[PDB]
Design a protein around this ligand. Structure first.
Ligand code: HEM
Ligand code: OVM
Ligand code: CL
Length: 393
């Protein structure tokens, strides 16, 4: 009944160009079985959306990577939000939602915007830059660690730690095992910065620790909630902003539309998240026998959701392989969907909006002028190097 495929969605060949294999996964059927890793896969929008929105049947507390926490020990203590189910998920999720709230965005927006404008001005003085290291990495590094309340020393651990975390959702391939082999110094730094005395007053981390007296979380839960933000809050935005710049560099007609109406910046970033899907995949684990797309899946089975493929499913999207900054993007699953939908999405969208606004107002052209190099990760899609020439407006 269920088609069996030999595609490895975590192989370097797949990462290098995933779109043909993603169509093969979609067109084989609503539910496939991946013989390489003994998991079920869903690559169409409908089934990915359905799985995300049934957390009772497709749970997260047995891990959202390949490893099943009921069978193997997690490589680090489980996240209290990403790797939890309702009801244990509910109150930690509420705290992070209030920490990363609209009111918090109003407090930091002017600073985030000023830093975006300053970075673009700085880059325009150089002309020829690397849009990854000098922009997609440099800008989030210039705002997010400060907004967290982190000290200056040791920030070089943040991107390596996040790369490790996202590699660790993958299967035990060389990417994952090499990441874990090098993990010790990055885990040590991150776990230490999660303690209340090491988080500056007014930042996200101090606000988490201040929310430990309402009956929603206890003081011993705050370090792991800070860890969630230090795991998921930086590398994601790096690849999201990098995706947006890569899109504008490849689709100059859309850069010209953005320049003519800078208020399109927020949707231009949202469309980049759909188009590239920086977070490509997550797993769930079935808690019972379930019918999905006419197929019967037993209890305790891993289900791999192809978020990037769902975001390019022609059953759901018109011209899915086109970057369109005025597309109605509502419903894309690049931030997930349902009870686990990205709790930091307001931060991600704020960073992306103000950076694309700075580009819209200050830059006339973005031309690739060097070899493009891809960065390989079991969960994240993005570039290692994006040489571009920026022409001032
Ligand atoms: C372009 C940027 C980002 C993308 C594409 C992204 C993607 C996602 C996705 C797909 C999920 C759902 C995970 C699941 O269903 O299992 C998620 C959840 C989450 N994200 Fe984001 N994210 C981004 C930025 C951020 C930022 C800036 C933060 C923090 C400041 C953050 C923190 C989190 C956390 C803690 C969760 C877990 C939420 C929960 O389980 O309830 N992310 N993200
Ligand atoms: C996609 O959201 C993420 C990603 C990685 C880690 C976490 C966390 O809670 O530690 C969350
Ligand atoms: Cl850790």
């Amino acid at each position: 009944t269920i088609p069996h495929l030999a595609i490895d969605p975590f192989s370097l060949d797949f990462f290098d160009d995933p779109y043909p294999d993603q169509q093969t996964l979609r067109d084989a059927g609503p539910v496939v079985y991946l013989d390489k890793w003994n998991v079920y896969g869903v690559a169409r929008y409908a089934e990915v959306h359905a799985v995300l929105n049934d957390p009772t049947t497709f749970c997260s507390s047995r891990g959202v990577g390949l490893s099943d926490f009921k069978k193997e020990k997690p490589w680090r203590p489980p996240s209290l939000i990403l790797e939890a189910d309702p009801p244990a998920h509910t109150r930690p999720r509420a705290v992070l939602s209030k920490v990363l709230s609209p009111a918090t965005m109003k407090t930091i927006r002017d600073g985030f915007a000023a830093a975006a404008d300053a970075k673009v001005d700085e880059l325009l003085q150089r002309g020829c830059i690397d849009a990854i290291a000098d922009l997609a990495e440099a800008y989030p590094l210039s705002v997010f660690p400060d907004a967290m309340g982190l000290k200056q020393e040791g920030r070089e651990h943040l991107l390596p730690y996040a790369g490790l975390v996202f590699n660790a959702f993958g299967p035990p391939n060389e990417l994952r095992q090499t990441a874990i082999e090098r993990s010790a110094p990055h885990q040590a730094y991150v776990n230490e910065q999660c303690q209340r005395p090491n988080l500056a007053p007014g930042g996200f981390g101090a606000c988490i620790h201040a929310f430990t007296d309402t009956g929603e979380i206890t003081p011993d839960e705050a370090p792991l909630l800070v860890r969630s933000l230090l795991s998921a809050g930086l590398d994601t935005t790096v690849n999201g902003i990098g995706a947006a710049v890569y899109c504008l560099a490849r689709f100059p007609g859309e850069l010209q539309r953005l320049r003519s109406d800078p208020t399109l910046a927020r949707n231009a970033f949202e469309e980049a998240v759909r188009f590239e899907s920086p977070v490509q995949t997550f797993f769930r684990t079935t808690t019972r026998e379930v019918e999905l797309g006419g197929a019967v899946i037993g209890e305790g089975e891993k289900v791999l959701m192809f978020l990037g493929s769902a975001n390019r499913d022609p059953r759901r999207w018109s011209d899915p392989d086109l970057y369109d900054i005025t597309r109605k993007t509502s419903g894309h699953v690049g931030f997930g969907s349902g009870v686990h939908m990205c709790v930091g999405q307001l931060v991600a969208r704020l960073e992306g909006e103000v950076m694309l606004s700075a580009l819209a107002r200050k830059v006339a052209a973005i031309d690739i002028d060097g070899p493009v190099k891809r960065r390989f990760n079991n969960t994240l899609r993005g570039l290692e190097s994006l040489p571009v020439k920026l022409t001032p407006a």
